[PDB]
Point group: C3
Chain length 152, copies 3
């Protein structure tokens, strides 16, 4: 095949840290889900979609790790090894947040830079669940992504 | 490109409008989320998928009215064609805790086919449920997901 | 059309059975959502995406059923009739579960069998919502699917 389709969905649950004094020593205390990444839901979903289209599994098969751009580049390199380049990708951030549009083009530029394609092959959008569900109650954010790969 | 893929997702939270008498004056009172559209979740998601495939952003850039979602849809298509694209095909998945909609599906398909100037055979619409789970399952609103494939005409 | 795109989304709410004695008679008692299938969200989502790409509606139009592979093969038969073959498929299982990777390849093989394609054209990945939402609270599981059909 010379054309592949892929999809990704990722969630980041909010969590917080606070200092505690126990036994005369200060220890950090984490509340909520324990993160093993910067929580970049947009890049994680995109990574899964690109790996997915090439049938390379998912983010959980890259480094058998925190910075998502590093994972994203690793996924693109693996898709290159198989002979693919980016046709185009589309990202949909699902978050109960207002202004993120001012940063949208900055996100596109970096993604384009990491996928070695033009910024015009990258689309990013943000929408809300209108106060509904876990994103609506602001317990976390999610993201959905689709990717089209083309044979080089 | 010669072929582009796009994705859209949208949610409509239920709200209610009731008349009230305050200060001797009749006034409208809105309960729930304040909509700024007709709440057409299927057309909103579809509109975002087509703009997304062409890298035109999202529905929130079509008109810097919104009461009618078919207008926004046509406007998105107008812009997509301006970049040289026509519809390859689209598939829409309505997510709602509801039953009978099939009688209405084909009618939806025709309207969409018309606004995208394509054949109905290029437009698919389906409805599924979350089996009573989540916000759609608890009947607090509805959602919709959509994917689109654009081609150079 | 030479290329077709499709999307699928399915959810399976948990339900358990309980034997009871009523009127001196043993009768099974069901708790929760009454299932009408094997609850396979992966094959159901996939089925919807394959039919959806060919504009054949959804899985609820196949046999006017306790085995999702039967339904999947039937779905492929109908798309096959319209002159389509599988380009590639990508499945994203959403569940608050861990060890599923050991079973993912086995799933890919079964899917590759019912779609009469190579396993290289089938991708299955699994992710969680980080304890959030209905899947995060373990009330059920969900699945997202996309499919690319090509004129055979």
């Amino acid at each position: 095949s010379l054309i592949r389709i892929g999809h990704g969905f990722d969630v980041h649950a909010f969590g917080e840290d606070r200092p505690l004094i126990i036994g005369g020593v200060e220890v950090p205390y984490h509340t909520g889900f324990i993160a093993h990444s910067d929580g970049d839901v947009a890049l994680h979903a995109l990574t899964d979609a690109i790996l997915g289209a090439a049938a390379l599994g998912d983010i959980g098969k890259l480094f058998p790790n925190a910075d998502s751009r590093g994972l994203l580049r690793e996924a693109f390199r693996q898709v290159q090894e198989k002979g693919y380049k980016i046709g185009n990708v589309d990202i949909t951030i699902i978050a109960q947040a207002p202004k993120m549009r001012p940063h949208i083009d900055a996100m596109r530029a970096k993604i384009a830079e990491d996928l070695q394609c033009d910024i015009e092959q990258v689309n990013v959008k943000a929408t809300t669940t209108e106060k509904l569900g876990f994103t609506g109650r602001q317990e976390g954010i999610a993201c959905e992504a689709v990717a089209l790969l083309i044979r080089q």
